Amino acid sequence: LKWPRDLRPLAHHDLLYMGQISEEDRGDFNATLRNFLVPRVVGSQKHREVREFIVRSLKDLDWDVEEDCFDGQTPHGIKPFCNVIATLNPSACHRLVLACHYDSLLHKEGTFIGATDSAVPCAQLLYLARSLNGKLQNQKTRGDGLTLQLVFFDGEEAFERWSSHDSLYGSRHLAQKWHEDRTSAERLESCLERSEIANQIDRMEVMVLLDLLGAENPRFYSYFGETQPVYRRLVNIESRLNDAGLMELPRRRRRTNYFSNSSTVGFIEDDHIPFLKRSVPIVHIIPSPFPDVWHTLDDNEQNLHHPTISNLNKIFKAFVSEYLQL
What we know:
alpha/beta; 9 helices; about 35% helix; signal; EC 2.3.2.5
């Protein structure tokens, strides 16, 4: 079976313009990121402040923003959680869904910033929205049944020992709410004709999950067959960007090669898992191997590699522009 949306390739000139990262872009992304570079412990004050910042930032760009709050029991007792869900055009039938988590790991030995995990991926999502905003507001006007949706999960990390009950507090909750919330094509703007929509979860066209990003030389693989047609667009985009000479490398005539055009499995359990059990196609942008710093106290700003971040932003901007045909 083919992908349900025709896969039409980014115009060369957009490819170039997405491949730019000016001084202002660097400044903007870094100023976005600085707000995240604090420990974001579930239930904490800084955690709350981080959430408020995400919300203000998306509402300031006329997205619909939802704060999805609930309490859950954990090995460390009861905790409040708030997922943040931002949707450009609510009434659009289908969503390209980009996601990360904004909670940080409770480390035993001290303050854990969680720069790759997932401060940077949270910055990346907001940066995309801010930099592509004019185009996103133009795309919305089409009313052609597709929009962009960002989710910033809460409580992804295990408090004690990773298990089915201790991890993914936010995803498990939202996946479930949305599965149970019934709808149909006739209640929604411009569904594709083949569509069989019985609930909100059916409206997630593909879920692209970002985690552990910001270190040198990531290596990604396609972790899901269902989503290989989409994963391929990442490989192709990285390649066009290198051809165009728009990747940042240490010497001239080098090429990045982050997205390996091959696959493996892992099943690195994550925020995708509860959506996957209800048939939501998934692309997990997570590296194999995990970085140096994973879950150490040195997952901090000093260990972030700004040339890699820039390159990835290029790929993500272009990727979103191609999927949504901006």
